[PDB]
């Protein structure tokens, strides 16, 4: 029955990290009295922890923003290729945002070029699409949410070559349509472009805030 106790605390650790927060510590032993033939176990902890503060912000790598708008599908130093069997090109741009404190630069191509036809303001024959899938009940949490589906005058895209093989290095290009056409179709319910319909959503549940729900 010998009562053990703590000895002297050792040297404190220096702050491990060069940015932000870290943790320093001190180590003590139960070496001077020592519990012999039983007793207790020195009463407490052989380890203290402490937070150290370097007060300097940390590297954060930049992240890509979303891609911009596609450029028009025209040719440089020419005119336009609207409503014509001429494949062109168009470009798109990104922006690296958020890079601070010697962080890593954004990895990848900041530009994007793809091949295109042009149906910008092109009068195209059209046909009414079938009923779209029912949308979301809007407004969520607001008074009387309603869904919405719609039929729209879908243009008949012209039967062009979707794959255009260029020479030089024999590069074949997946060509996709660009532009807002002018779809021509017969009226359905007094409307030429889009006729929709709304229906109210049944048995709407109340929105309860998850931090207000846990508490």
């Amino acid at each position: 029955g010998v009562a053990g106790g703590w000895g002297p605390w050792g040297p404190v650790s220096p702050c491990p990290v060069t940015c932000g927060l870290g943790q320093t510590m001190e180590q003590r032993t139960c070496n001077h009295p020592v519990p012999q033939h039983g007793g207790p176990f020195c009463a407490g902890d052989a380890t203290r922890t402490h937070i150290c503060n370097t007060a300097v912000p940390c590297p954060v790598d930049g992240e890509w923003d979303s891609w911009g708008e596609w450029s028009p599908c025209i040719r440089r130093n020419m005119k336009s290729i609207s409503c014509q069997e001429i494949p062109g090109q168009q470009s798109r741009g990104r922006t690296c945002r958020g890079r601070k404190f010697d962080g890593h630069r954004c990895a990848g191509q900041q530009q994007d070029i793809r091949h295109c036809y042009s149906i910008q303001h092109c009068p195209l024959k059209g046909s009414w699409s079938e009923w779209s899938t029912w949308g979301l009940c809007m407004p969520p949490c607001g008074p009387n949410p309603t869904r919405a589906r719609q039929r729209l005058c879908t243009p008949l895209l012209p039967k062009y070559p979707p794959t255009v093989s260029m020479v030089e290095g024999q590069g074949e290009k997946n060509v996709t349509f660009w532009g807002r056409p002018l779809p021509r179709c017969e009226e359905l319910q007094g409307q030429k472009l889009v006729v929709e319909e709304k229906r109210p959503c049944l048995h709407v549940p109340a929105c309860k805030d998850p931090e207000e729900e846990e508490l």
């Epitope: 650790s13 491990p16 927060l21 870290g22 943790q23 510590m25 180590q27 380890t47 922890t49």
Partner: nanobody
Amino acid sequence: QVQLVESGGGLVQAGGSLRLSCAASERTFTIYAMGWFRQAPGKEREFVAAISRSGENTDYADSVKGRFTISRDNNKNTISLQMNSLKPEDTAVYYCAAGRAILVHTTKKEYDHWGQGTQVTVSS
């Protein structure tokens, strides 16, 4: 930044015991979480044991749990690996490793500082 020196290896009979020690740089010792690795002939390097900066939290590989014990002496800038019931499959070059840990109770498996190694050979 930190240098690591292993010691205690040698030739042991099967079932015997061996105690390795790893000396690290004195001024930066309590900053780094530390551990033991080994690399057998013809095999990749594998995790053996880890210890936090505290010496209070340990982690072990399943192949050595119950046989090996990692300890830390924060008075004398050393860690130790007490290897009991040694088998011929434990023959490897044993490496001491050091790794930066933000918390003092965190055990790591990824380390960016490595010693030169100590040879442990177990004969049947």
